[PDB]
Structure formats: C-alpha cells, structure tokens
Design a protein around this ligand. Structure first.
Ligand SMILES: *[C@@H]1O[C@H](CO)[C@@H](O[C@@H]2O[C@H](CO)[C@@H](O[C@@H]3O[C@H](CO[C@H]4O[C@H](CO[C@H]5O[C@H](CO)[C@@H](O)[C@H](O)[C@@H]5O)[C@@H](O)[C@H](O[C@H]5O[C@H](CO)[C@@H](O)[C@H](O)[C@@H]5O)[C@@H]4O)[C@@H](O)[C@H](O[C@H]4O[C@H](CO)[C@@H](O)[C@H](O)[C@@H]4O)[C@@H]3O)[C@H](O)[C@H]2NC(C)=O)[C@H](O)[C@H]1NC(C)=O
Ligand SMILES: *[C@@H]1O[C@H](CO)[C@@H](O[C@@H]2O[C@H](CO)[C@@H](O[C@@H]3O[C@H](CO[C@H]4O[C@H](CO)[C@@H](O)[C@H](O)[C@@H]4O)[C@@H](O)[C@H](O[C@H]4O[C@H](CO)[C@@H](O)[C@H](O)[C@@H]4O)[C@@H]3O)[C@H](O)[C@H]2NC(C)=O)[C@H](O)[C@H]1NC(C)=O
Ligand code: HEM
Ligand SMILES: CCCCCCCCCCCC
Ligand SMILES: [Mg+2]
Length: 335
C-alpha cells in the first residue's frame, strides 16, 4: 500500500580511507533479474553487495552505499540520488532501479511517470559519455569498447598512459565533438551539461586508490575493472576524504563550452541555448527539474503526493548547499 520515506543519511562517522573490496563485499556475477545501468559507481557497488545485488534500492541505501564504498561526499550523494529518484524511481515504494524497468520497483506509477530507472534518457542520463554511447545509437547503458579505446588513446596521448585531469579536459571536448558530428538529436543542456563535467573527474577523485596522495591518476587496468566488469581493483581503498567533483572547473576551462544541442535533426549544427543552466547559473537546474517533476506528476493526491513533497524537500536540502543557495519551490504545497 506504500512506504513512509526517511530523510537522507548524513555523512559517515568515519571519513578516512579503508579497504572496501573486503571479505563481506565480494564481487559476484549477475543472476537472472539483476539490474545494471549507465553508472559504473552504482554498478560496482551492486556487484560487490554494498547495494542490493539485484540493482534496485532505496534512496537511503544508495546514499549510504556511495559513502561506504567510495567516500562520495554526503551532499553530492543527496543531489544525485534524489534527482534520479524523483525522475526515474517509484515514490510510493521508495525504490529506484539503477538500470532499466523491472517489476522489482513494484506497482507502476500513474503515467506520464514511469519509474523506469536510470536508463531513461532525456532529463537525467544524456549524451557524450566516456564509456557509454548516445541513446540515438540504440544503447545508452552498456559498456562500449570503442569508446573505452578512445579513453585509452587519450590517456596515452595526454596522461602518460594514465587518466588524469589533463586527459579529462581533452576527452570531454572530443566526446562533445563526436556527438555533434554523428548524433542529430544531440543535446547538451540543463542537467546533462552539469553532470557531464563532474563525471569526467569522478574516476580521478573516487576510482584512484585513497592511499595515493600525490599525482592522482587512474590505470587502464583499474578503469576497465570498474567501467566494464563492475569490479573494484584488488585491495581497493576508498578516497581518504569525502569527495565528488573537484577539478570539474578546470575541465571546462581547458575547452570552454556553452549548453545547447544540434538543431533541426541535423549533424554539425550546434546551437547555443541561453536559458539552460550552467556553472554560474546552477539554480536553473533546480527550477528545470522541479518543472520536469510536475510534467511527470501533474495531479497527485495521496501517499504519492505526500512522498513527492518529502523527496522534493530532501533533494532541496542538498541542492541548497551544493548550488550556494536556491529558493525552495512548493509545487504541491506543504504536508
Ligand atoms: C597528466 O599526466 C601528464 C603526463 O605525465 C602530465 O604531464 C606533465 O606536465 C608537466 C607540466 O604540466 C610537465 O613538466 C613541465 O614540462 C614543461 C615543458 O617541457 C619542455 O620544455 C622545457 C623548457 O625548455 C626551455 O629551454 C629550451 C632549451 O633547452 C628551449 O628550447 C625552450 O624554448 C624553453 O625555453 C624543456 O626543458 C623540456 O625538456 C626537458 O625535459 C625533457 C623531459 O620531458 C627532456 O627530455 C629534455 O632533455 C629536457 O631536459 C621540455 O621539452 C616545462 O617547461 C616545465 O618546466 C617548468 O617547471 C619546472 C618544475 O616544475 C621548473 O624547473 C621550470 O622553471 C619550468 O617553469 C615542466 O618541467 C611534464 O613534462 C609532463 N609530462 C609529460 C610526460 O608530458 C600532466 O601534468 C598530468 N596532469 C595533471 C593534472 O597531473
Ligand atoms: C559504440 O559506440 C560508437 C561511438 O558512438 C558507435 O559508433 C558510431 O556509430 C554511429 C552510427 O552508425 C556512427 O555515425 C555515423 O557517423 C558518420 C560520420 O563518421 C565518420 O566521422 C567520425 C569523426 O567525425 C569518425 O569517428 C568515424 O569513424 C567516421 O569516419 C556520419 O556521416 C553518419 O551520419 C549519417 O546518419 C545520420 C543519422 O541518420 C544523419 O543525421 C547524417 O546526416 C548521415 O546521413 C552517422 O552519424 C559513428 O560514426 C560511430 N562512431 C564510431 C567512432 O565508430 C558504435 O556503434 C557503438 N557500438 C557498439 C554497440 O559497440
Ligand atoms: C549517488 C547516486 C548516483 C547516481 C544516481 C548516479 C547516476 C548516474 C547516471 C544516471 C549516470 C549516467 C549519466 C549519463 O549518461 O548522462 C552516471 C554516470 C556516471 N557515474 Fe554515477 N551516479 C551516482 C553515484 C556515482 C558515484 C558514487 C560514482 C563514482 C564512484 C559515479 C560515477 C559515475 C561515472 C564515472 C559516470 C560516467 C560513466 C561514463 O560516462 O562512461 N556515480 N551516474
Ligand atoms: C554522476 C552523478 C552526477 C552528480 C550530481 C548531479 C548534479 C551536479 C552537482 C554539482 C554541481 C557543481
Ligand atoms: Mg550517457
């Protein structure tokens, strides 16, 4: 009949490095029904049992897992998790798929809401990923070896055979160029414009072993292990400090870029969007997403309305800190 959703966990008591690839969290292969998706972080956490191994979890479980497994910073975890949950999760059962649709999220919500998981393209997941192809080409969730080959190439060319901040700057730009030239539906605005810069530094800040204090750089063996196999490196120790998107500013600065997309269903036709969120206009992302939620839930009434109000508030608590102050919106009023 429904669940009453708890407020998000706070930061972990212990915030130092530790062994995360340990006896209680062994890698195991997929069973029938297990779900995986476009996030190598959540994928690895599920395949090591930090999340439920079936790849369906509550917001709270996702937050505690990203913190325990990788030392993802609390506010960043809140901002990402409730974004994903509002758009792609089931607010009544409080379950989110980290991939595509599954009966495991429970009785479906009223359309146009879907609870179709992080695979759903267009508002959250989008284009110019590092190891995933654009949705226009048919698969936005599976690892793509050709794209990983380019990851390797750019690491060879700019990072001495390792992935570092310099490589991220170059790879991010080049992937944008690839999508401009080949994808007539290419979008790079709003949520995607913000997430696309952070995602390129997560491998440096979170996938590099926490015992490495200087000259942080990711080997291709470790990259492959996480991005392709959903497996922590042997003896992997998480970041020694809570972390997220440190260095994303520098990635943008290496090749300044403006939100927009290919217009009129044609390649090599990128038009700027001046209304999109960007890095000096972050609250636009908040307002946009709240708009998107209204489109999904145009007139909720019961347990659903209640859980929407709570999840929206939860998200705001993170957004407010992360974005440096945003006026909370109340599209369904108060409880
Ligand atoms: C991601 O990973 C990559 C890959 O590892 C990593 O890249 C390193 O980046 C750092 C800097 O960002 C590099 O180190 C710097 O290299 C600068 C460029 O060096 C060239 O030019 C030097 C300057 O030459 C002067 O004199 C000659 C006359 O001899 C003249 O022609 C020139 O015009 C100029 O006036 C030159 O010395 C250097 O050649 C030396 O070194 C090579 C070895 O690379 C050797 O083979 C040569 O024989 C020679 O000894 C080269 O051609 C350099 O200018 C810069 O120096 C500054 O800093 C040092 C100390 O930090 C000071 O001593 C000095 O005052 C300078 O101000 C510095 O050394 C490094 O080489 C990169 N490594 C690689 C492999 O590319 C990224 O940093 C990583 N990213 C992140 C974010 O971590
Ligand atoms: C793994 O991921 C890769 C990368 O995303 C996928 O490969 C891409 O597949 C698409 C679809 O076939 C390719 O798109 C086509 O590209 C043509 C241009 O490509 C050349 O130029 C680029 C560099 O600019 C080179 O990298 C590339 O090797 C080529 O030499 C376009 O001309 C095509 O356009 C036509 O169709 C569109 C859509 O209908 C129209 O809008 C156009 O007007 C035109 O008629 C087209 O966009 C793309 O090039 C591929 N990239 C690479 C590097 O391979 C894999 O399919 C994916 N596969 C899996 C599952 O592993
Ligand atoms: C906390 C909740 C999280 C959510 C909801 C989430 C969601 C997502 C989604 C939807 C994508 C795909 C983006 C796209 O294609 O546009 C993605 C990509 C990514 N995520 Fe996560 N993520 C989370 C946490 C993490 C953590 C903790 C890490 C690292 C440890 C991480 C690393 C990545 C990376 C590297 C990518 C890019 C993959 C690629 O482009 O090849 N994420 N995430
Ligand atoms: C892969 C997870 C994406 C991170 C969360 C989306 C919003 C970005 C917040 C950081 C602002 C600089
Ligand atoms: Mg993508």
């Amino acid at each position: 009949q429904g669940v009453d959703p708890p407020p998000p966990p706070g930061p972990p008591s212990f915030t130092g490095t530790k062994l995360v690839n340990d006896a209680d969290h062994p890698w195991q292969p997929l069973r029938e029904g297990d779900i995986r998706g476009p996030c190598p972080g959540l994928n690895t956490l599920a395949s090591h049992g930090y999340l439920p191994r079936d790849g369906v979890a509550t917001p709270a479980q996702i937050i505690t897992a990203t913190q325990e497994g990788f030392n993802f910073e609390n506010n960043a975890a809140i901002v990402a998790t409730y974004l994903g949950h509002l758009l792609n999760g089931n607010l009544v059962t409080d379950l989110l798929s980290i991939g595509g649709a599954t009966p495991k999220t429970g009785p479906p919500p009223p359309p146009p809401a879907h609870a179709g998981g992080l695979n759903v393209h267009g508002t959250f997941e989008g284009d110019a990923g590092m190891t995933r192809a654009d949705e226009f080409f048919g698969d936005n969730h599976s690892f793509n070896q050709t794209l990983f080959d380019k990851f390797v190439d750019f690491s060879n060319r700019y990072g001495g055979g390792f992935y570092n901040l310099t490589v991220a700057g170059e790879l991010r730009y080049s992937r944008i160029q690839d999508s401009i030239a080949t994808n007539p539906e290419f979008q790079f605005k709003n949520v995607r414009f913000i997430t696309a810069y952070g995602e390129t530094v997560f491998p440096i800040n979170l996938f590099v072993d926490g015992r490495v204090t200087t000259d942080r750089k990711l080997s291709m063996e470790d990259a492959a292990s996480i991005f392709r196999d959903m497996r922590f490196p042997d003896d992997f120790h998480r970041s020694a400090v809570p972390a997220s998107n440190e260095g994303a500013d520098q990635v943008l600065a290496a090749h300044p870029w403006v939100p927009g997309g290919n217009a009129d269903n044609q390649v090599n036709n990128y038009v700027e969007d001046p209304d999109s969120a960007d890095f000096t206009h972050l609250c636009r992302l908040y307002e946009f997403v709240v708009g998107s939620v209204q489109e999904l839930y145009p007139n909720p009434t019961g347990i659903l309305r209640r859980n929407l109000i709570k999840n929206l508030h939860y998200w705001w608590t993170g957004v407010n800190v992360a974005f440096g102050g945003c006026d909370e919106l109340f599209p369904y009023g108060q409880l």
